[PDB]
Amino acid sequence: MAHSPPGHHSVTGRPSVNGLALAEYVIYRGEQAYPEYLITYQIMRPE
Amino acid sequence: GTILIDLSPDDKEFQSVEEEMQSTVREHRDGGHAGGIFNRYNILKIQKVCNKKLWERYTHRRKEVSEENHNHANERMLFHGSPFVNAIIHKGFDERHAYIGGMFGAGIYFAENSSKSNQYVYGIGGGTGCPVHKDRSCYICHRQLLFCRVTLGKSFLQFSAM
Ligand SMILES: CN1C(=O)C2(CCN(c3nc4c(c(=O)[nH]3)CCCC4)CC2)c2ccccc21
Ligand SMILES: [Zn+2]
């Protein structure tokens, strides 16, 4: 794995083109996330 | 060590997690190529993931981060799609869950858009789609996502052409 930039703990990627997209995030230590909910689902065909 | 507790659809906690799934769907610039074409999900089951060891691993690091960031963990709830969801819930995130070809380096990636994480349930770029039909837009096969608790601490802001 890589490291977060010095003095940081993560990276926030903000969309500068698509105004409708939300942020994506990166961490570099697995102990900084907990997998709290497991969601089972189907995608739905548009009507 | 991992226990999975089914939530009832009548439980308030089920309903708020479903609404986070549903309200963060968006259209993607690939036209649905990687994740499928949809505006919303059929949510079949929501389970709470309980593992004392993994949880104490999380809260121990959260306190270190918080103390290096003016007492602010900067904790979010974020989605994560992966073929390795089953390994993740029993063993936790580690460096084998890091995306080498990721846009911000070799780390573990999360999304606020559920439909973004949906693009990775069958692999990078949707892989070859579902195991049964090889269909990245399969409306039949059941999929799984993780809704995760994530400590960001001091976060480096990257303005990506996304
Ligand atoms: C190690 N490995 C990975 O890490 C992924 C799965 C998880 N991946 C991921 N990437 C993103 C988002 C997300 O939920 N999951 C949302 C935000 C944007 C990017 C990255 C790729 C993978 C697929 C196939 C084989 C190996 C791997
Ligand atoms: Zn299928």
Side-chain angles (χ1 to χ4, degrees), chain A residues 1-46, chain B residues 1-95 97-162:
Chain A
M1 272 203 281
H3 302 64
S4 46
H8 298 71
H9 309 94
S10 62
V11 176
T12 292
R14 306 193 81 65
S16 65
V17 170
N18 187 350
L20 294 190
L22 297 182
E24 304 162 19
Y25 303 84
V26 197
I27 66 186
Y28 305 88
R29 297 186 196 194
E31 50 269 27
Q32 268 171 230
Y34 181 86
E36 188 150 340
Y37 299 92
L38 177 62
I39 300 164
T40 308
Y41 69 97
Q42 296 157 318
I43 56 158
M44 295 204 60
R45 190 192 307 264
Chain B
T2 289
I3 296 301
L4 304 177
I5 308 277
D6 273 50
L7 306 180
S8 173
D10 303 337
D11 183 334
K12 290 288 186 56
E13 190 174 2
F14 184 108
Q15 292 165 10
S16 62
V17 170
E18 162 155 25
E19 156 76 5
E20 294 281 5
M21 273 281 284
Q22 302 280 23
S23 65
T24 61
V25 178
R26 64 172 176 92
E27 301 190 295
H28 293 270
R29 294 175 311 188
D30 69 355
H33 170 96
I37 300 184
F38 62 99
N39 304 309
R40 70 177 276 104
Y41 310 102
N42 183 16
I43 304 286
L44 312 153
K45 184 181 286 180
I46 295 174
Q47 290 156 305
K48 177 58 148 301
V49 177
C50 305
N51 184 311
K52 201 167 89 75
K53 183 177 188 186
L54 294 183
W55 175 249
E56 285 171 3
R57 199 162 77 99
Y58 177 73
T59 62
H60 181 276
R61 175 62 185 162
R62 181 178 66 188
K63 186 189 162 172
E64 296 187 325
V65 168
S66 167
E67 291 180 356
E68 294 170 2
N69 190 42
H70 46 90
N71 303 305
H72 180 37
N74 202 11
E75 177 170 89
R76 312 289 173 92
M77 293 293 312
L78 300 173
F79 295 98
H80 182 84
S82 167
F84 309 122
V85 168
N86 197 86
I88 294 175
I89 61 184
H90 290 96
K91 296 293 180 182
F93 293 100
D94 58 53
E95 87 275 3
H97 303 102
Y99 187 9
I100 306 289
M103 282 215 311
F104 314 108
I108 308 143
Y109 286 72
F110 300 85
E112 282 177 12
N113 286 126
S114 69
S115 56
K116 184 51 147 191
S117 288
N118 174 76
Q119 295 184 324
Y120 297 89
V121 301
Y122 295 131
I124 290 169
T128 62
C130 67
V132 169
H133 311 99
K134 319 275 196 173
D135 186 357
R136 277 179 302 265
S137 201
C138 193
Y139 301 106
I140 300 164
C141 289
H142 296 183
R143 307 177 186 207
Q144 287 186 321
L145 273 190
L146 295 179
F147 195 38
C148 301
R149 199 174 284 265
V150 179
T151 299
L152 297 179
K154 168 70 169 193
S155 192
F156 183 87
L157 207 59
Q158 184 75 53
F159 292 100
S160 57
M162 293 283 99

